[PDB]
Design a protein around this ligand. Structure first.
Ligand SMILES: Fc1ccc(-c2nc3n(c2-c2ccncc2)CCS3)cc1
Ligand SMILES: [Ca+2]
Length: 268
């Protein structure tokens, strides 16, 4: 590990562990090196590994809008994950904080890419469970978005989930009320929160009561088409929420820019 990778500065730390910038020695490939202590691991899978490793392996085959796991290591008291690192890069949270509410053309491109990435995970049998601005990286040169942090994820199933350790303000009312949710419909809710965040520059709900009330107020000028899509994704009844197909077939989602085109217009 220490022979294969050259460690750089700390990028961040938190519930996910500690992430360092790094370089692969063999070919100077930019990487991210994530350390997590074993006793801080709550979810295990299978060799006994963090569920995160299991999930990442399932989604890291081939190209995608997901940050890929290149390798991993077990230490006596920790696991070390080697992940892709775009450069230059900025997470969506920082980007929005910096630039404010996004133009709908830009939000369309970003949201479309997030949808394709989430579809990839689900098709690979993986549920992310923590879709939000902080867990989305922007390749600033290519205009490509990449999903990160499967640490709260789970294998995708059609039965009910009774556990959740993702972000509460992105969590659906059925979780708040009943501690029960289904994967896809819960994902769609979080995507509704995300889309609002893109076009308004902030999330629509802070309190549990606002979430379960489900009333959406717009603080920025947002097109009626976009408002409709957001409110559809944020339907109180899970079964009233759109499928991924319905979201991507929505009138607001038409004529999306290519990632490179998005970068040239909005990022370069
Ligand atoms: F180029 C990169 C920048 C951030 C990451 C990254 N990948 C993960 N986390 C972070 C991250 C790093 C720093 N601050 C916040 C999140 C958390 C769990 S998985 C990877 C590559
Ligand atoms: Ca947010």
């Amino acid at each position: 590990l220490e022979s294969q990778y050259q460690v750089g500065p700390l990028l961040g730390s938190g519930g996910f562990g500690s992430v360092y910038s790094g370089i692969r020695v063999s070919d100077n490939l930019p990487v991210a090196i994530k350390h997590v202590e074993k006793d801080r691991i709550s979810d295990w899978g299978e060799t006994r590994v963090p569920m995160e490793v299991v999930l990442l392996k399932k989604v890291s085959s081939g190209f995608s809008g997901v940050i890929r796991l290149l390798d991993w290591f077990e230490r006596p008291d920790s696991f070390v994950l080697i992940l892709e690192r775009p450069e230059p890069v900025q997470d969506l949270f920082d980007f929005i904080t910096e630039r404010g509410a996004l133009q709908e053309e830009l939000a369309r491109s970003f949201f479309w890419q997030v949808l394709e990435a989430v579809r990839h995970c689900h098709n690979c049998g993986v549920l992310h469970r923590d879709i939000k601005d902080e867990n989305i990286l922007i390749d600033l040169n290519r205009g490509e978005l990449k999903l990160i942090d499967f640490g709260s994820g789970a294998l995708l199933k059609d039965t009910v989930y009774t556990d959740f350790d993702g972000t509460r303000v992105y969590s659906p009312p059925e979780w708040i009320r009943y501690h029960r949710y289904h994967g896809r419909s819960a994902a769609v809710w979080s995507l509704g929160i995300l889309l609002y965040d893109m076009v308004c520059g902030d999330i629509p709900f802070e309190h549990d009561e606002e979430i379960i009330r489900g009333q959406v107020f717009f603080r920025q000028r947002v097109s009626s088409e976009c408002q409709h899509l957001i409110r559809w994704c944020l339907a109180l009844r899970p079964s009233d929420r759109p499928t991924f197909e319905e979201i991507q077939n929505h009138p607001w989602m038409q004529d999306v820019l290519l990632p490179q085109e998005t970068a040239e217009i909005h990022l370069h």
